[PDB]
Amino acid sequence: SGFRKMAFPSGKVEGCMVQVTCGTTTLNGLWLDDVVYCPRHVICTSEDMLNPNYEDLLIRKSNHNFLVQAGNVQLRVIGHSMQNCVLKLKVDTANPKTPKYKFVRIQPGQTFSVLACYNGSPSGVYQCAMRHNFTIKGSFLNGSCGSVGFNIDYDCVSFCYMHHMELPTGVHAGTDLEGNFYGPFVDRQTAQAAGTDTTITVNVLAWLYAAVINGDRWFLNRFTTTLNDFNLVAMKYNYEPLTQDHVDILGPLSAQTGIAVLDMCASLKELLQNGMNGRTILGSALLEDEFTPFDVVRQCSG
């Protein structure tokens, strides 16, 4: 037992990370087969970063303007192209460490692992969720641009996030691997603000099930509630509405614990209206909303 914020093992992604430099601008890239993927922002000089026209900037470049370093090896660029906010640099060598992989876009409330990298060198791995306002509460320093987020299903790395930038509130914004931003953001060094965020209700419930599986039961109660009378109370506290599909997704956890979903909702209603009275759940003093039903099952059952 026990419950941690667990990331996927990151080795399959580490063997893909490279450094990309254009001029004095540098950041991380992702090398899969004979293509290197990276934020197109790398073709911006310091004075270009404020208000770039990327089509203009890219036509003024050739392959020899891009320096790609894979460890101690320089990869020669033999082709370049833009796809939305990602640059694709064709190289003359296919990555021998390419894993089976997929480019998938994720939904708010889903989780993924991040491999934070600097100058093409992996430095750390952590688990994050995509918030309702399409930001993530990441941990990143200067140089982290191009770090990727991913999930692993069996042997296949599903890449879902490429990091681009930090917003003024300190949260992080980026794109899927086809270069399409998550949320209403653009890749220019201007102040941009995220919309309002909500608590991911289904995840909180999933985490309450995790707690029960691990012997934390103090928040349970004999009451029950209706799906509508719960949402009426959850909106008040800035929680996403619960749907019948969320209850279905929570089915398996309901079974393993024998606690009907709507019953667990009753406990959540009480926790929101009374607080925790100085107690904790799974070692935390607030309600955690960055574990999905699937993450719970993976860690608490097998």
Residues that bind a second copy (CB under 8 A): 1-12, 14-15, 115-116, 118, 122-126, 128, 137-141, 166, 170-172, 214-215, 275, 278, 280, 283-286, 298-299, 301-302
Q: Give the up-direction half-sphere exposure of residue 67: CA atoms within 13 A in the CB hemisphere.
A: 11
In the complex with a second copy, which residue's Cβ is closer, 77 or 115? 115
In the complex with a second copy, which residue's Cβ is closer, 107 or 280? 280
Q: Which span sits near ligand A1EGN by CB under 6 A: 7-15, 54-62, 160-168, 240-248?
A: 160-168
Distance of CA 24 to the CA centre of its chain: 28
Binding flag, residue 246, ligand A1EGN (CB under 6 A): no
Least separation in angstroms between residue 274's CB and a second copy is 13
Per the structure block, which two tokens stand in for 162?
Answer: 């490429």
Distance of CA 224 to the CA centre of its chain: 34
CA separation for the pair 252, 295 (Å, rounded): 13
Q: Give the up-direction half-sphere exposure of residue 37: CA atoms within 13 A in the CB hemisphere.
A: 23
Q: Which of 4, 53, 60, 141 binds ligand A1EGN (CB under 6 A)?
A: 141
From ligand A1EGN, a second copy, none, which one binds at residue 11 (CB under 5 to 8 Å depending on kind)? Answer: a second copy
Chain position carrying tokens 């653009």: 186
What one-character-per-residue DSSP string does 228-283 give?
Answer: HHHHHHHHHTTBPPP-HHHHHHTHHHHHHHT--HHHHHHHHHHHHHH--TT--BTT
From ligand A1EGN, a second copy, none, which one binds at residue 209 (CB under 5 to 8 Å depending on kind)? Answer: none
Least separation in angstroms between residue 116's CB and ligand A1EGN is 9
Contact present, 5 and 139 (Cβ < 8 Å) = no
In the complex with a second copy, which residue's Cβ is closer, 263 or 295? 295
CA terminus-to-terminus distance, the chain: 10
Residues 250-269 that bind ligand A1EGN (CB under 6 A): none
CA separation for the pair 230, 224 (Å, rounded): 10
Q: Which of 22, 85, 128, 145 is catalytic?
A: 145
In the complex with ligand A1EGN, which residue's Cβ is closer, 239 or 291? 291
Binding flag, residue 53, ligand A1EGN (CB under 6 A): no
Compute CA distances 63 → 27, 98, 190, 295, whole Å.
Answer: 17, 23, 28, 42
Would residue 64 show up in a list of annotated catalytic residues for this protein? no
CA separation for the pair 264, 1 (Å, rounded): 21
Binding flag, residue 216, ligand A1EGN (CB under 6 A): no
Distance of CA 232 to the CA centre of its chain: 29
Would residue 145 show up in a list of annotated catalytic residues for this protein? yes
Q: Which span sits near ligand A1EGN by CB under 6 A: 25-33, 63-71, 196-204, 263-271?
A: 25-33
Binding flag, residue 25, ligand A1EGN (CB under 6 A): yes
Task: Report strand pairing: 111-118 vs 148-153.
Answer: antiparallel
117 DSSP 8-state letter: E
Q: Which of 16, 38, 41, 172 is catalytic?
A: 41
Least separation in angstroms between residue 180's CB and ligand A1EGN is 13
Region for residue 163 given its phi and psi (left: phi exceeds 0; alpha: psi -120 to 50; beta: otherwise): beta
Residues contributing to the site for ligand A1EGN (CB under 6 A): 1, 24-27, 39, 41, 140-145, 164-166, 172, 187-189
Catalytic residues: 41, 145
